[PDB]
Structure formats: structure tokens, C-alpha cells
Design a protein around this ligand. Sequence first.
Ligand SMILES: COc1cccc(Cn2c(C(=O)O)c(Sc3ccccc3)c3cc(Cl)ccc32)c1
Ligand SMILES: COc1cccc(Cn2c(C(=O)O)c(Sc3ccccc3)c3cc(Cl)ccc32)c1
Lengths: 258, 235
Amino acid sequence: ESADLRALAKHLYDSYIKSFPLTKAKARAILTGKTTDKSPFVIYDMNSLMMGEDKIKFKHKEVAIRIFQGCQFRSVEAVQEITEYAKSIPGFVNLDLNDQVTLLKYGVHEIIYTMLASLMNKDGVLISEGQGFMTREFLKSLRKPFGDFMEPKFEFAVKFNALELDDSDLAIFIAVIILSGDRPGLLNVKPIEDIQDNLLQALELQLKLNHPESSQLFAKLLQKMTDLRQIVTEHVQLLQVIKKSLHPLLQEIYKDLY
Amino acid sequence: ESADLRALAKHLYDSYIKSFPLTKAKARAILTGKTTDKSPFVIYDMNSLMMGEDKEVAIRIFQGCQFRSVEAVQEITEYAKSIPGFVNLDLNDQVTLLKYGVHEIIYTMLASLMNKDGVLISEGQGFMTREFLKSLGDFMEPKFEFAVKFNALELDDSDLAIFIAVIILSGDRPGLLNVKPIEDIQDNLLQALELQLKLNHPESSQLFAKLLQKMTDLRQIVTEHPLLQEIYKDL
Ligand SMILES: COc1cccc(Cn2c(C(=O)O)c(Sc3ccccc3)c3cc(Cl)ccc32)c1
Ligand SMILES: COc1cccc(Cn2c(C(=O)O)c(Sc3ccccc3)c3cc(Cl)ccc32)c1
């Protein structure tokens, strides 16, 4: 069955390519300065933060807070991308609608962090679709609860990026994360795990063929999901330190994804 | 290398038997009224509890359960010594791996002594029900929910021995000095488990991943709410 595993891999990558406008390949080309196209506007200090908000578009009233809503606007945009990609996954839209919601409900945070790692090196993050680069030192230097809440994301990213996965690897990895059969409140786990079974097989082969010099990559990738679920837990906790940010209709768009 | 990987598997299993006096095989013989062993005393309520230990109750149960963690770190430590390469690692790092990896192993091995209804105590001589514990009041519910999920994998002692070695030797543990020698040991512990599951469960569909995915669920129980106070010092 090594032929349908290749065809499954490809066509998650094909849908991945169209669901997500900014890929890892493109993020690394920009980060490394590593070819033609363009250098991003760098946010290293308060004066660059304020100049970045003119030429740079921002579809999104103190400064460190103005960085939360921006990060929150953006994560909610990402949900609709992850939601579209989920639908390209063979078997997903035949699942019970309730289960589809539960898978996304719990899956989108873990996928957001995975994808946030593609835009991060140890020095900072690509923001505003590669057009910008906020430095890491500019982020530790934010106030009170804003001083961290990005810093552990970087911690995980530097470690995650060391696996040197490409977009074709991540397409399957993300699919694996969505079709996760232990989301609280799933009504029907049989097809969920039979789809995840395929994806794991497709992933195991992809890592084999794509990183043939890298012995236990499938297993080391799976261990990362234990770091992923922990980072998600302490972010949902740091957002009950940030119920202490006004809409309200924006509290009502941007409270979840969902 | 599939002779190296059988040798390693069988080495860890031997050390496992020798380190842990109550195995899962023993626990399952005791739990299912199997004949080789003797039925436990059952603690379902208050004068069962009273009659079993022949100030208050809840925190005195929490004193016992906390001390069972003591011999358990005495035993996990002894096992970790037999893991090829462990004692070669930097002294500080040996400690770092033990401190963060021990509770995840406790909960793995507590799944062996549990069913849907309760837990074995005193090397399998007693049996505390889930509801007498739910009568105190929360601290055991996640253990039981993981235990029920895990025991579905139908893992036995030879599988757990290797899987537990995989836990202890993780290079993601906060503040490891020399990460690379630790990853090197896990890599061959990883392909020894993969050979163990394909050879022991020839019919288990993608069991290897299913088991490492369960490493998530273990990490989250650990986020629960004085040789213990010195393991907890920062996590
Ligand atoms: C996984 O995709 C993303 C999810 C959330 C954010 C981002 C990039 N990004 C953005 C953005 O709006 O593009 C933002 S908001 C922003 C950036 C610069 C100036 C004002 C707002 C952001 C903030 C942090 Cl602390 C980290 C990453 C951030 C990408
Ligand atoms: C996996 O190794 C174990 C780690 C901790 C506990 C146990 C079994 N156990 C014990 C014990 O003393 O053997 C105990 S302590 C105990 C309980 C009643 C009377 C006397 C002691 C315990 C308590 C809970 Cl709430 C759950 C499991 C427990 C086993």
C-alpha cells in the first residue's frame, strides 16, 4: 500500500499549499535573507513598532496590549485556514458534524503553535505575512504578563525547528494532530482513528523517504506533541490572567477559535 | 541491528522484574481472581478502611499514597541505573532526567494496578475502590481516566520496561547540560520498543505511535495539584 500512502502525502501537501499562503519554505527564505524577494521591516524597538504600523497594513490602546489584539486577530484568521485544510483531509467531512467541531475546537491551538514555529528563529518571528519581523528582545522587554507568553513559544520553536521538517512533512503532521481521537466529548472515534491510522502511516513513510539519514524521526516528531499540548495549556492559563481588552463585539469574535 | 534490539529489550525487562516487586502480570492475576494468587482485602468505605490497616482519613490516605511514591522512586532509580548509558551521563543530568521522569513512570505503572473500579494497595494485598476515594476527593480521577485508556493497549511488562526507559531518557527535560548523549540513548530505546511491539503485537495497528501519543496524556496528569517536595521544586 506504499502507493496510496504517497498519493495521500502529496495531496495533503497540495491542499496545504493552497490553504496556507505563507509556507515554511517561504518563511525560511525570508528569514535567512536567502534570496529574491524582500527584507522585512524589523520591530526591535518602540520607534520601529510605531513606524511599522503605517506602511504595514494591519487590518486590526496601550502598546503591549496593541500587540495582543494583533496576535489575536491573526490567530483567528489562521483558524479559518486550518478549518479549510481540515476539509481537504480524506474522511474529515464525512465525520459527524459535532465531532468535526470538537476536533477543530481542540486542534487549532496545537496547529497554530506548530505553524508559528515556521515563522520563528531564535531571534524573532515573521509577522504580517512575512512583511515584518518582530525581534525576540523586543518581546521579553514588554511589561508584566507580556514579558513572557511569547518566550516559551520560542523555546519550543527553536527545538521544533531543529527537526528541519519541510512543508510536505508538516502537511501530514498537522493532519495527524487534527484527527486526534482523544478530544473530550467525541461521539464516534472509530472513523477518526482509522483516518489517523492512515495519516500516521503516510507520515511514517514520508519521514523515511525525506529524511532517510534521520533514524527515529517519526517517534521524535510524535514526542513533540507532548510539548505542544503543554504550551497550549499554559497559554489558556495566561489568557485567564488577561481577563484582568475591550469590545464587546471584538471580545465576541476573538475570544475563541471556533 | 535486530539482535542488538532484542538483547536490549530483554535486558531492560530483566532489570524491570528485579527492580519492581509487583509486576503487571502479578497485578492482573490478583485483579481477575486468577488462581496462582490470593484475593485482596477490599476498601469500599470507612470501617473497611479502618479494618484494612490492621488524624482524620483523607490526608492519612494522602500520607500513605505519598509514601508509596517513596519506595517507588527508590525502585525507579534502581531501574534507571540498568538503562545502558544512564550512569555514564553527567551527574547533574542523571538527576534532571530522574526528577522530571519519575511521576510519568509512576502513573504508567499505576495503570497496571488499576481497573475501572479501583486500585491495589500494599503490594497487591488490598484493594481500594474508586468511589471511596471519590468520597474524600479529586486527586485520583485523572489517574483512573488515563489508566482505563492505557490498559486498552493491552501492554504487558516486557513492553512497559522498554517504554519506561524511553520516558526517563528524554532530552526535552528542563536544564539538561549535555542533551546529545541523552537523545542518543533514547533513539536506540525507541527502535527497541518498535521491534518489541511489532514482535509482541503483530496484529496491533500502528501501536507504536498510539503508545507515544499516550506520552501526551502522561505529561498532563503530572500537571496535578519531603523527598517529593524536592522533586516538585520547579516543573
Ligand atoms: C501561526 O500564524 C500566526 C498566528 C499568530 C500571529 C502570527 C504573526 N503575528 C502577528 C500578525 O498579526 O501577523 C502578530 S500581531 C502584531 C505584530 C506587529 C505589530 C503589531 C501587531 C504577532 C504577535 C506576536 Cl507576539 C507573535 C506573532 C504575531 C502568525
Ligand atoms: C505504581 O506504584 C504505586 C504508587 C503509588 C501508590 C500505589 C498503591 N497505593 C498505595 C500503597 O500504599 O500501595 C496507597 S496508600 C494507602 C491507602 C490505604 C491504606 C494504606 C495505604 C495508595 C493510595 C491511592 Cl489514593 C492510590 C494508590 C495507592 C502504587
